Design a protein around this nucleic acid. Structure first.
Length: 164
RNA sequence: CUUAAAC
């Protein structure tokens, strides 16, 4: 994490971080996608099924923070987009594709969608778990989430990796 | 206008 100085982001010095490099106001989770149908449907319908392992932390983060999902292909590490979580976990509105690994659904608001290869994105994702590959549904640091948002935005504005 | 958000 950032060792900039109390602890602050290395991208924006006004963002104060906890001792895990997380901002209490803006929080970021990686969704590793291995199912073309699921990601395709989520891009059309803006509903996502949340894995049981990550569901409680995501739900708790939603209480007091803006919460974002960053979608990455598990096998290729292509960035698929990012979205804000705009509903808490619920059992009322589930995607048809959810199964026993999922706790329930959330509504998302897509900010960007893409199918993007970026070697910096790949390197971030490869080292996201304290230097090892990202685990599905893990929270990342403020600066990782911000940098990924920036890279996706940059690619899109350069007309690279667009899906629309 | 596929303009990250927040600060």
């Amino acid at each position: 994490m950032s060792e900039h100085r109390e602890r602050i982001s290395m991208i924006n010095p006004r963002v104060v971080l906890d001792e895990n490099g997380i901002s209490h106001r803006s929080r970021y989770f990686i969704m590793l996608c291995d199912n073309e149908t699921a990601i395709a449907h989520a891009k059309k319908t803006s509903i996502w099924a949340v894995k049981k392992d990550s569901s409680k932390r995501i739900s708790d983060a939603y209480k007091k923070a803006s919460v974002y999902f960053i979608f990455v292909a598990q096998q290729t590490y292509n960035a698929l987009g990012y979205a804000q979580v705009v509903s808490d976990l619920n059992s009322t509105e589930l995607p048809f594709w959810s199964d026993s690994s999922h706790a329930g659904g959330v509504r998302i608001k897509w900010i960007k969608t893409c199918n993007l290869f970026s070697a910096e994105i790949s390197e971030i994702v490869s080292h996201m778990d304290h230097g090892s590959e990202a685990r599905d549904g893990m929270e990342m640091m403020y600066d990782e989430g911000s940098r990924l948002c920036t890279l996706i935005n940059y690619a899109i504005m350069k007309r690279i990796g667009r899906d629309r």
